[PDB]
Symmetry: D2
Subunit: 158 residues, 4 copies
């Protein structure tokens, strides 16, 4: 069996719903996939339950280091800081990362007016990802821009 | 009829899907609701189509100023800068704003350990929204934390 | 006639606090008729008894924005500061011009053809991104500059 | 024995460039045995012919991270810089300690009972937020400080 850690923000309803939607597609791909989704394991917010950052980081890292493959969602105004740190841990431990990046503002490389606009001040139409975090992914993994490509890449790594 | 402008990030698949999911619930609320969703009106990314920031801001503002009510999604690591600007325009023009904020890290006010942890350095478990943007909303509108409360608030403003 | 300037920008980290003070000093040295309001100079000292909720936070800041003749906005950061973005929207709707500063070094490279060709690859964009709705509101009645020299020069022309 | 320090932090705006240089000067003045690497001092001059994609960007920076004995990280900003967060994850997994600086003025007010009671209201949190996974990795082998004085004091103790 292949153990997958699904890295991604899990705090808003938009992200919670999208994670569950993607994960079910990944789990229906192959019965040997053992995917760990953090939102499925978080304790319901109770007034007596508490864990500090050290406990949080230690428990989260244990799930990362136990996986064979990390699936990371990079979308947002910036890459989620927790996801970025998890990618750094995975790279240093040799765990491959397949990342999904669907931002519609990444398209336009064939649009010569978008390219020319870069000569103007504050006219860039291409969304930006921190290239250090991206480079760590590509040094052992891949960044895909569609759910179709993500499922195929996970399938080819089984 | 009541015209609504749905403000929110519309670039990732997670946000695109969540916007369409929420908007259909808002439209099924009342037949007099005329909701404008920007993603339903964006041109398909074609290599010849281009508009600079001034054209983008002018067309977007025209849709904001034509609405009777603004629905704003505040979730994310930060409030979307475009949404924040749209809220500033709406407040200065007297257009009310009903905002949705579902981040699960906002809960814990009854957790005394989370409160005590604030005496430590870098142990805050409560997600942060820029309070200037939030204040503009509350000066003429409301911030709700659930889709159920959002639909009821929109219903009560018809 | 005095020119009242509102200095919009994040003011929470030491890096931003020091940079705001370093820029405001240069702006005030341009002309004696400049009456610049800097929010960090008016913030109340942190006290366990004092409290102001979001409504009176936004109202107090908006009062200073609306009383200004020109708004200087700092756009740098991983994203445009949400408060600054909202203040820009207020300024545009009220007709108050905005001169914005954007020094991010990742905005350069329009002449580099390899940077342009890299956009055909997934996740290889080297150009920092600003939300173009916020930028457009500035340019519709103002200007975005990329250096402190051009910022001071633009402020002088608007006196 | 020399102590090699990697200075992690955003280095793209003038505010961050000036603050990094202002802090690094103080750090180097602590002890002659400090060999601090500052990425902005090694960046190539912007040239339309030079290009490095994300893989060689990450590799070049990781080489400097892994060659260090201590990592100093700046966490301020609306969010922790994504590159800094990744570098912290690399440092933790390799066992390189991290001393982080976090000066955001919105972290104060734990004694204010009205700030604490305001958390029962929707969208009234006055306390700035840092991703606690990134913070936890630091404290598991290092420390987070809230002032430049405590940063220099902590660096001296680790020499």
């Amino acid at each position: 069996m292949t153990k997958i850690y699904f890295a991604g923000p899990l705090f808003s309803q938009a992200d919670l719903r999208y994670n569950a939607y993607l994960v079910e597609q990944i789990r229906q791909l192959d019965k040997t996939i053992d995917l760990y989704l953090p939102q499925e394991n978080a304790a319901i917010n109770d007034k007596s339950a508490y864990a500090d950052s050290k406990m949080i980081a230690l428990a989260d890292t244990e799930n990362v280091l136990a996986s064979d493959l990390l699936v990371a969602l990079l979308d947002g105004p910036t890459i989620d800081a927790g996801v970025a740190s998890e990618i750094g841990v995975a790279y240093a431990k040799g765990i491959p990362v397949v990342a999904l990046y669907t931002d519609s503002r990444q398209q336009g490389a064939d649009n010569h007016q978008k390219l020319d606009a870069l000569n103007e001040i504050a006219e860039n139409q291409f969304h930006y990802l921190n290239l250090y975090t991206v480079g760590l992914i590509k040094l052992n993994g891949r960044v895909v821009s569609s759910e179709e490509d993500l499922l195929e890449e996970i399938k080819q790594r089984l």
